[PDB]
């Protein structure tokens, strides 16, 4: 289903714990090292349930995967610890996964990006990708992101990942635009309810959706202290977030800050049924 792979220490399980199991960036340092493959069955959109093959990272396991379980094993999120002394190793184990994969969607994550200094982050991601894409051609076009636990770009990672397996894009984009129309918004965003990943934009900050994913994850993770789950939040009458469907939450931003609450919430509720 979903292959979570990469050498030891690269925080595969750390990611799994954050975006899925709702660990925070801090608590994940607790996690014991993945022994063989830890499977995780969790649903997205209700309609599709996902199986997360959180593979082992240690070389013992790694070299085993391409041996007595190669057929068994064969999307692949392959992650990369930036600091690795043995870079060309990790490149070549990626190559090892690749050939067996022709036996049978590829995503590369430069994880732990929070460690390398801000200036040589751009340059360092560039050179690494220049390589991996060339290696990947044996696929023609490779898409992969810089990824850290300590920033929001982890969410933007999996957003562009999960939506790659969502068929609703044709239906939903049509069904969301048609909500933007009536509401006279600046934009509406659709997120999944539990994971908080971006599903769809309607129509001037570029890092909106990744950040919102983060801020909202943290309000919701914070809400536990009051002992109840998040439903709605209304800001300045400008910004509206509502729980909507059983497997959807919407971030609306209105153009006028005085269209009465009960109206927006009423229109939210009528639209709520559809999707």
């Amino acid at each position: 289903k979903l292959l979570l792979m990469g050498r030891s220490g690269s925080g595969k399980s750390s990611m799994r714990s954050i975006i899925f199991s709702n660990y925070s960036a801090f608590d994940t340092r607790r996690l014991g090292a993945t022994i063989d493959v830890e499977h995780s069955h969790l649903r997205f959109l209700g309609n599709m349930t996902l199986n997360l093959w959180d593979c082992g990272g240690q070389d013992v396991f790694m070299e085993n995967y391409f041996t007595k379980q190669k057929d068994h094993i064969f999307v692949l999120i392959h992650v990369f610890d930036v600091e690795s002394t043995e870079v060309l190793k990790d490149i070549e184990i990626f190559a090892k996964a690749l050939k067996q994969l022709r036996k049978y969607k590829i995503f590369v994550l430069l994880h732990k990006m929070d460690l390398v200094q801000l200036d040589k982050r751009e340059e360092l991601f560039q050179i690494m990708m220049k390589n991996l894409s060339e290696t990947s051609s044996e696929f023609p076009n490779l898409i992969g992101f810089p990824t850290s636990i300590w920033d929001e770009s982890l969410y933007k990672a999996w957003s562009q990942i999960v939506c790659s397996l969502i068929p609703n894009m044709s239906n939903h984009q049509s069904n969301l635009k048609k909500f933007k129309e009536i509401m006279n918004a600046l934009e509406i965003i659709l997120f999944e309810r539990t994971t908080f990943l971006v599903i769809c934009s309607s129509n001037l900050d570029p890092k909106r959706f990744e950040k919102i994913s983060n801020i909202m994850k943290n309000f919701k993770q914070s809400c536990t202290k009051l002992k109840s789950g998040f439903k709605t939040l209304i800001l300045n009458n400008n910004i509206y977030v509502s729980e909507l469907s059983s497997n959807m939450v919407c971030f609306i931003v209105l153009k006028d800050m005085n269209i009465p609450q009960e109206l927006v919430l009423e229109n939210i509720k009528k639209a709520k049924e559809f999707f």
Partner: protein, 100 residues
């Protein structure tokens, strides 16, 4: 000294002056109970309000009694009321419900 007297009375006068502000704000607030039982909103007629602004009339059947004819009254009545009703019609800018 005497300066200390004067200033000490003041500080205490300012102190009570603050107690006033507190008490006024405290007085001014509203409860949800007050909302439920409040008799601010009551049924009203114009008869009532003029009667609280704070036998009388004798009838005449004689034909000679009227200074405006029955036909004059009829025309004024129909005129006033129709002007009111016509002036009372008001149009929606568009459909109040939308599809989707």
């Amino acid at each position: 000294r005497l300066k200390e007297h004067e200033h000490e009375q003041k500080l205490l006068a300012r102190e009570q002056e603050l107690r006033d502000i507190v008490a006024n704000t405290n007085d001014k607030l509203i409860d949800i109970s007050m909302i439920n039982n409040s008799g601010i909103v009551i049924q009203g007629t114009d008869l009532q309000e003029a009667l609280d602004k704070r036998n009388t009339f004798t009838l005449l059947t004689s034909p000679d009694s009227a200074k405006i004819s029955k036909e004059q009254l009829k025309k004024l009545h129909s005129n006033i009321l129709n002007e009111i009703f016509s002036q009372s019609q008001v149009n929606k800018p568009g459909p109040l419900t939308v599809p989707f």
